[PDB]
Ligand binder design. Structure first.
Ligand SMILES: OC[C@H]1O[C@](CO)(O[C@H]2O[C@H](CO)[C@@H](O)[C@H](O)[C@H]2O)[C@@H](O)[C@@H]1O
Ligand SMILES: CC(=O)O[C@@H]1C[C@]2(C)[C@@]3(CO)CCC(C)=C[C@H]3O[C@H]1[C@@]21CO1
Length: 511
C-alpha cells in the first residue's frame, strides 16, 4: 500500500530445497539478476555474454591435438568446473512475478552429468573466427523461432583444419567462443570460470581419465556461491533514512538518464553488433603512464576512458547551457562482501554509482584544438568523474543499494521495456585486467609444458536496446575498447566514428 521504493527482502532470495532428496535447490533472483532475467528479454538473449579467446598451439611437436580430443578434454574439465562452480549448470524459469527463478539440480547420475557436459562443448573445422561464429549465431536466432533462454554456458572450438581428427599444426590457432546467459554470472564470474576451465583442462592433455576417482554428485551444492544479501559485511536491517534517500537519488538519476540528451538513434530492433579497438601494448602503457604523471594516485585509464566518452559525445553534438552529464555506471560489488566470500564469488555481484559532470561547455574541445586544451579538458572531466564515484563508493551500503535499485529497475523495465526515445546517453562499463582471472597459457599440468597460448580475449555482449555501451578491459598490457549497439538503431560507420573519436582523445592524453 505504501508509495516507497520496495525494501530488501533477504529471506526472499535464499537457496531453498524443492524436494525431499535435497538434490534440487532454487532461489528468486535479485538486483541486476532481475534486469537480465526479464523473461521476454532473456528468452531473446539480450545481454548474453560471449567471450572470444583466440589461442595458438605452442605445444611440443610431440603433443597431438585435434578438435575431437580437445572436445573430449574440455568435457572432462567442464565436469570438474561444475563440481567447483555449479553456476555453470543452473537453469532459469519464471512464474507470474518479474524476477526470474534460478534453479540448481545435482546430476541424477554420473552418466547424466557426462551427457550434460558433452552437450555444452562443440567443435567445427572452419576458418571462421570466434566472433564470426557469434555473428552467425545472432543472425540465425531471429529466423529460428525459439525463445529458449541460453544455457548458463556452452563452448565452441574452431580451427582451420579439414576434419575433427586432423592434427592441429604447431603455431596454428584454435578459437574458443564461450557463450553464457548473463543471468548466472557477471563479467567477473564468467571470466573467472573461463580461467578455471583453462586450468582444469591442463589435467587432461596427454592422457586414462575413465579410471580417475568418480565425482560424488550432490557434494557440489555447497559450492554454489551463497546468496549475495547474506554475504554482505553490512547488516541490511540496520539501514534507515540515509539509505532510502541515496536509493532515491539513484532511481531519480536512472529516470533522468533515460530521458536525457545523448546520441540520436533510429527506432527499431534488429541485430546485436560490436566494434572493437585493440590499443597496442605500447599505446596502452603510455596512456597508463600519462594518467599516473598528470593525475596521479587513485586515477586510472578507466576514468580517462569515461572522460573521452564525454568529450567525444560533446564533440559529436553541434545542449542546454545547464545540462549535466549524468550516467549510472556499474561497479563490481565484491568489495562489499565478507573477505572469505569476496574473492570466490561467481554469481552476479554488481552495484552502481552515478557519474556527474557539470560545466560541459568548459570541457568542450575539438580534436583540432591545441593539445594542452584537450589535456586540460580531459583532466577536468577525470576529476569530476573520480569525485562522483567517491560519493557512491565510499558508502558501506553501496552493494545493498545496488540490489534494491536494480530490483526497482527490473520492474521499471518490465513496464517500459525500451526506456529511451529519440536519443540515448552512452553507457560505460569498466572490467579491468583479464590477467586477474584468465591464465596466459593452458599448460599440461603433469609437466608444466605450455600447450596453448591465450593470445586474445574479447568480451562481447548482445545489445538489443538502443544505447551505446562501451566496455574497457586489458590483456597482455594492451587495453581493448569495444562498443555494443543494435544495428536498427545505429550504423557501423557511425559507431566506428564515435569509437575512433574516444580513442583519439585518450591518445591525446599521452605525455
Ligand atoms: O596503429 C596503432 C593503433 O591502430 C590500430 C592498429 O592495429 O588500429 C585498429 O583500429 C580499428 C578500430 O576501428 C580496428 O578495428 C583495426 O582492426 C585496428 O587496425 C590499433 O590496434 C592500435 O591502437
Ligand atoms: C548502470 C548499471 O548498473 O547497469 C546495469 C549493470 C549490468 C550488469 C550491465 C553492465 O554489465 C549489463 C551489461 C550492459 C550492456 C549494461 C549494464 O546494464 C545493467 C546490468 C544488467 O544489469
Amino acid at each position: 500500500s505504501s508509495s516507497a521504493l520496495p525494501p530488501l527482502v533477504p529471506a526472499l532470495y535464499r537457496w531453498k530445497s524443492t524436494g525431499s532428496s535435497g538434490r534440487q535447490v532454487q532461489r528468486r533472483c535479485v538486483g541486476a539478476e532481475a534486469i537480465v532475467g526479464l523473461e521476454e528479454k532473456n528468452r531473446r538473449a539480450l545481454y548474453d555474454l560471449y567471450i572470444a579467446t583466440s589461442l595458438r598451439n605452442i605445444a611440443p611437436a610431440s603433443t597431438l591435438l585435434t578438435l575431437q580430443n580437445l572436445k573430449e578434454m574440455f568435457e572432462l574439465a567442464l565436469l570438474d568446473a561444475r563440481f567447483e562452480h555449479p553456476e555453470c549448470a543452473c537453469t532459469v524459469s519464471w512464474d507470474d512475478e518479474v524476477p526470474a527463478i534460478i534453479t540448481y539440480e545435482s546430476p541424477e547420475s554420473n552418466e547424466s552429468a557426462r551427457d550434460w557436459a558433452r552437450g555444452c562443448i562443440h567443435v567445427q573445422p572452419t576458418a571462421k573466427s570466434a566472433l564470426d561464429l557469434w555473428s552467425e549465431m545472432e543472425e540465425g536466432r531471429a529466423a529460428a523461432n525459439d525463445n529458449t533462454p541460453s544455457k548458463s554456458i556452452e563452448l565452441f572450438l574452431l580451427s582451420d583444419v579439414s576434419t575433427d581428427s586432423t592434427p592441429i599444426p604447431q603455431d596454428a590457432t584454435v578459437e574458443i567462443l564461450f557463450h553464457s546467459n548473463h543471468l548466472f554470472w557477471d563479467g567477473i564470474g564468467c571470466r573467472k570460470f573461463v580461467g578455471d576451465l583453462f586450468r582444469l583442462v591442463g589435467s587432461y592433455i596427454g592422457r586414462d581419465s575413465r579410471e580417475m576417482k568418480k565425482i560424488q554428485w550432490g557434494q557440489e551444492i555447497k559450492n554454489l556461491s551463497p546468496p549475495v544479501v547474506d554475504s554482505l559485511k553490512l547488516d541490511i536491517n540496520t539501514l534507515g533514512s540515509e539509505f532510502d534517500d541515496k536509493c532515491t537519488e539513484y532511481t531519480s538519476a536512472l529516470v533522468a538518464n533515460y530521458k536525457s540528451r545523448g546520441m540520436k538513434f533510429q527506432p527499431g530492433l534488429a541485430l546485436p553488433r560490436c566494434v572493437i579497438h585493440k590499443l597496442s601494448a605500447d599505446e596502452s602503457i603510455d596512456i597508463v603512464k600519462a594518467v599516473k604523471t598528470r593525475l596521479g594516485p587513485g586515477f586510472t585509464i578507466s576514468h580517462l576512458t569515461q572522460a573521452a566518452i564525454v568529450l567525444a559525445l560533446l564533440d559529436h553534438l553541434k545542449l542546454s547551457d545547464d545540462e549535466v552529464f549524468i550516467s549510472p555506471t556499474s561497479v563490481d560489488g565484491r568489495r562489499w562482501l565478507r573477505e572469505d566470500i569476496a574473492s570466490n564469488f561467481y554469481a552476479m555481484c554488481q552495484t552502481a554509482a552515478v557519474v556527474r559532470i557539470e560545466n560541459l561547455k568548459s570541457i568542450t574541445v575539438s580534436h583540432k584544438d591545441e593539445k594542452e586544451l584537450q589535456v586540460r579538458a580531459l583532466e577536468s572531466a577525470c576529476r569530476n568523474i573520480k569525485k562522483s564515484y567517491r560519493q557512491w563508493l565510499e558508502n558501506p551500503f553501496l552493494q545493498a543499494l545496488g540490489l534494491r535499485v536494480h530490483n526497482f529497475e527490473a520492474s521499471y523495465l518490465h513496464a517500459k521495456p525500451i526506456p529511451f526515445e529519440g536519443e540515448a546517453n552512452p553507457l560505460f562499463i569498466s572490467d579491468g585486467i583479464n590477467e586477474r582471472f584468465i591464465p596466459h597459457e593452458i599448460k599440461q599440468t603433469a609437466t608444466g609444458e605450455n600447450v596453448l597460448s591465450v593470445e586474445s580475449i574479447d568480451f562481447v555482449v548482445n545489445q538489443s536496446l538502443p544505447y551505446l555501451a562501451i566496455r574497457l578491459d586489458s590483456w597482455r598490457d594492451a587495453s581493448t575498447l569495444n562498443i555494443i549497439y543494435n544495428d536498427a538503431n545505429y550504423t557501423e560507420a557511425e559507431v566506428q566514428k564515435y569509437l575512433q573519436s574516444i580513442v583519439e582523445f585518450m591518445l591525446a592524453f599521452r605525455l
